[PDB]
Amino acid sequence: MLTMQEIKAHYRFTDEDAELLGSLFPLAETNKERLADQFYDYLLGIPETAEFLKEDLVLQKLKQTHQDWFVSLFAGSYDNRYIHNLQKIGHAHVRVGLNAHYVNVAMNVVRQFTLSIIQDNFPDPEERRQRREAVEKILDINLDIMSASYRE
Amino acid sequence: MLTMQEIKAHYRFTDEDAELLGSLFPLAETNKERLADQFYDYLLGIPETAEFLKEDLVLQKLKQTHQDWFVSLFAGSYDNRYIHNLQKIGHAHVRVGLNAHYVNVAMNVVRQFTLSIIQDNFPDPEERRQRREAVEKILDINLDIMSASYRE
Numbered sequence: 001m002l003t004m005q006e007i008k009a010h011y012r013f014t015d016e017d018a019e020l021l022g023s024l025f026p027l028a029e030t031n032k033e034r035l036a037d038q039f040y041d042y043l044l045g046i047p048e049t050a051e052f053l054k055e056d057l058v059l060q061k062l063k064q065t066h067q068d069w070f071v072s073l074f075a076g077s078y079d080n081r082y083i084h085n086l087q088k089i090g091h092a093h094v095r096v097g098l099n100a101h102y103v104n105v106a107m108n109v110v111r112q113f114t115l116s117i118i119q120d121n122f123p124d125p126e127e128r129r130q131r132r133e134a135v136e137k138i139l140d141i142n143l144d145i146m147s148a149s150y151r152e
Numbered sequence: 153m154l155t156m157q158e159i160k161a162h163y164r165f166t167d168e169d170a171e172l173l174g175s176l177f178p179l180a181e182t183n184k185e186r187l188a189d190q191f192y193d194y195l196l197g198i199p200e201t202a203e204f205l206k207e208d209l210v211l212q213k214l215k216q217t218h219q220d221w222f223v224s225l226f227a228g229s230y231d232n233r234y235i236h237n238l239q240k241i242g243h244a245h246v247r248v249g250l251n252a253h254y255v256n257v258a259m260n261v262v263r264q265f266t267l268s269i270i271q272d273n274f275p276d277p278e279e280r281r282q283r284r285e286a287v288e289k290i291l292d293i294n295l296d297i298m299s300a301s302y303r304e
């Protein structure tokens with residue numbers, strides 16, 4: 001279960017999926033600020049998550065921190081270093097007192113945004129299917145490892 | 153645990169999403185045996201999950217149990233009874249001893265299958281978008297509540 005190789009096998013994530021995520025890097029990068037604004041504004045709309053963004057109003061760091069994570073989904077090198085880093089990300093949220101429910105909530109926001117980029121840029125059905133399948137795997141892997149930080 | 157109303161607000165799940173899911177019920181009904189076979193075969197194909205299907209071998213009651221859950225996604229009405237039932241579903245996996253990682257894996261299988269039904273049956277880009285968005289919300293809400301069952 002615990003190694004990256006094992007996790008990839010369970011999700012049937014292969015080098016083809018990694019190549020497809022790399023092929024989406026330019027679109028993700030083009031759209032990174034739109035993603036960051038929509039992500040940040042959605043959180044500002046829920047009082048419970050809005051709390052965590054009060055100090056950030058002045059510090060002005062957290063929009064960039066989550067923007068950078070989004071870009072990393074497409075950066076390649078999905079290896080044991082990548083999983084270790086996700087475990088760290090998960091624990092950061094546990095440490096500040098964020099309920100895991102809001103991680104699931106946030107991940108829905110990213111998922112809808114990214115699938116809309118795919119729908120809007122890939123008219124060919126099988127190109128679209130393959131890119132959607134790769135993105136759903138990486139988002140689900142991210143959510144899986146982060147969720148496990150609340151248990152472990 | 154949160155109320156259905158609060159969960160819907162966090163996921164921006166509206167009466168329109170509930171109506172779209174209800175409208176997918178006949179489509180679900182005509183794909184349910186294909187879903188049930190693919191879901192059960194995927195679990196047989198990982199040794200860790202296949203261990204939990206040993207007792208089920210002869211009559212495959214669990215294949216039906218999982219099929220029935222899939223069709224229930226498309227009931228078109230969702231209130232506190234639906235959240236309570238998801239807690240019961242999560243708890244059933246906790247009590248048999250299944251690591252929650254495999255619930256995330258299985259939800260990716262169902263997600264990919266269901267989004268292919270949407271792509272394969274809805275040529276109109278906006279009809280597709282709206283149905284995909286409703287499906288991703290209800291799957292993410294199921295995953296969210298089931299995950300919560302593993303936290304004291």
Ligand code: HEM
Nearest residue numbers: 043049050052053065066069088089092096102103106107
């Ligand atoms: C898709 C879900 C999420 C992902 C992938 C994510 C990603 C990250 C990353 C990469 C970091 C930097 C952690 C580190 O390396 O130290 C971080 C920190 C942080 N995130 Fe998130 N995040 C998510 C959801 C949320 C939500 C919903 C909130 C609520 C407002 C939030 C608030 C925070 C805060 C407050 C920190 C800094 C913790 C500290 O002060 O040490 N995150 N997040």
Ligand code: HEM
Nearest residue numbers: 195201204205217218221240241244245248254255258259
């Ligand atoms: C999308 C993820 C899954 C969903 C939505 C789901 C759904 C369900 C439902 C609705 C039940 C009946 C619960 C009840 O009313 O008592 C159940 C039971 C069960 N499921 Fe799943 N399931 C999922 C993943 C899995 C996985 C990955 C396995 C691994 C083999 C599994 C094995 C079982 C077993 C063994 C039971 C019976 C537990 C008992 O003895 O009561 N399920 N599931």
